Amino acid sequence: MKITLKIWRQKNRNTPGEFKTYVMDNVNPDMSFLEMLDVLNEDLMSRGEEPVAFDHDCREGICGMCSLMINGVAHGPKNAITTCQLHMRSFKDGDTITVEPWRASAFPILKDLVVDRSAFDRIIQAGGYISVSTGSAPDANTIPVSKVAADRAMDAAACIGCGACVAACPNGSAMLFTAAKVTHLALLPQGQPERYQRVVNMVAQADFEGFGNCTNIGECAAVCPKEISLETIAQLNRDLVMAALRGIEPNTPIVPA
């Protein structure tokens, strides 16, 4: 396959970026998208140009490192997959593919396609956990969790933290990520003691970090690799309304280190 690539190239955070065009004479349909970027990087290194930098660790769709806006869609045209799980058989010969980072105020760009997604870490730090210390846990079968609640909480908990919901959201909102964590911890009994605080804190943190609001559009759910539903956002909304009825005040925001 002959593939034309329009890739965002940015030197660093301050330097303005642009689109550079790279022509791949031979692309294997079985070759993955990140593998094709690797071949392009090897070609650039042999030619003497600056290689394209992109985040990637697992190449399995589970770690959440890969974060590419491919042809206007987060993680490429094919849904329920990641950038690493996208292979070149999803494209055609002669196609032009535009490769971008995540565009969000809270997700700063550090390099050509690398994005700083530590705002998600700070959202998690603001209550996205169960405050249980090591050694104090009771027997693993002391509290029953219904198979339905466990399955729904595993559906929400399957969030690789890629930030593609923020990238595809027209508002640049972290609502799907936050709502997935809120729903995961709120469907289990162990997350009951601190759930109405947690949602508030988490929502406040997402505001503090610079994310937008939710217009209930659904692009976040459309591009989610793990098919995390908008029911998670409805659950977060129910939790926040219930916490407002209880007069739950957000804590101090998690400032960066």
Binding site: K6, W8, F19, M69, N71, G72, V73, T98, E100, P101, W102, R103, A104, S105, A106, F107, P108, I109, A168, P170, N171, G172, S173, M175, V200, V203, A204, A206, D207, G210, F211, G212, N213, C214, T215, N216, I217, E219, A221, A222, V223, S229, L230, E231, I233, A234, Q235, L236, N237, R238, D239, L240, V241, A243, A244, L245, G247, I248, E249, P250
Partner: protein, 239 residues
């Protein structure tokens, strides 16, 4: 620690405020369309409806007391709606200014799979705000869009709402402005009737399609009625 007033502290809480005020405003818009459908019933019926709006529960409630309570509720709901909409729009703009190709492009390409509800909601909201101001100045007060000697203010309990409506939609520019506002209000209702349920958490897998259908029904009914009014007045069906 401040109670339900903690909703103002979060963007999700402001969105919940928008959902409640939008419940109120959707109800009012539906009831308004239903009431204004009495133009086709006739001038006597329309003027009786206009007068009985003010004389609502007369043997128990005073003149215009229920109407003034409804007006205050509408004003508070729309003010909270516009304030929260402004705050949320500004937040979402700041959420994209830093990392974007321009001030008008976020991505070199951003294909949409789930609708353009942000664009329609925000632009239609600004249009609806302008229309509400102009429409109050037009039909409620008759201080704009009227030739002299055409608008009849209420005289005690005698109302000439039918005459004001007939003489209001004569300029094609006013008719076009009303039609454009009704198109954007149809888009507003089509998204927002479902979205206000999703914002309060009153949504799931099985009722999502039902709420989408309810949104379509509400938007279509309001759009059809509210564009039938000025078109029929302009074309001579209502005279």
């Amino acid at each position: 620690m401040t109670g339900v007033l903690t909703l103002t502290r979060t963007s999700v809480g402001k969105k919940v405020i928008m959902a409640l005020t939008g419940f109120v405003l959707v109800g009012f818009v539906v009831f308004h369309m239903y009431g204004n459908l009495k133009m086709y019933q006739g001038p006597e019926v329309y003027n009786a409806y206009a007068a009985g709006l003010r004389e609502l529960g007369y043997p128990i409630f005073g003149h215009e007391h229920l109407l003034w309570i409804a007006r205050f509720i509408l004003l508070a709901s729309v003010f909270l709606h516009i304030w929260a909409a402004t705050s949320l729009t500004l937040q979402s703009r700041r959420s994209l200014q830093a990392s974007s190709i321009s001030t008008v492009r976020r991505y070199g390409q951003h294909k949409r799979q789930s609708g353009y509800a942000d664009y329609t909601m925000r632009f239609g909201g600004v249009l609806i705000f302008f229309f509400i101001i102009y429409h109050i100045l037009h039909l409620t007060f008759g201080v704009v869009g009227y030739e002299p000697g055409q608008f009849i203010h209420p005289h005690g309990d005698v109302y000439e709402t039918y005459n004001n409506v007939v003489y209001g939609f004569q300029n094609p520019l006013i008719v076009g402005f009303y039609l454009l506002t009704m198109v954007f209000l149809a888009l507003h209702l089509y998204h927002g009737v479902w979205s206000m349920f999703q914002t309060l958490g009153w949504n799931n897998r099985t009722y999502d399609r039902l709420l989408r259908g309810l949104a379509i029904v509400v938007a279509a009914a309001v759009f059809i009625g509210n564009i039938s009014f000025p078109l029929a007045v302009y074309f001579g069906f209502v005279a």
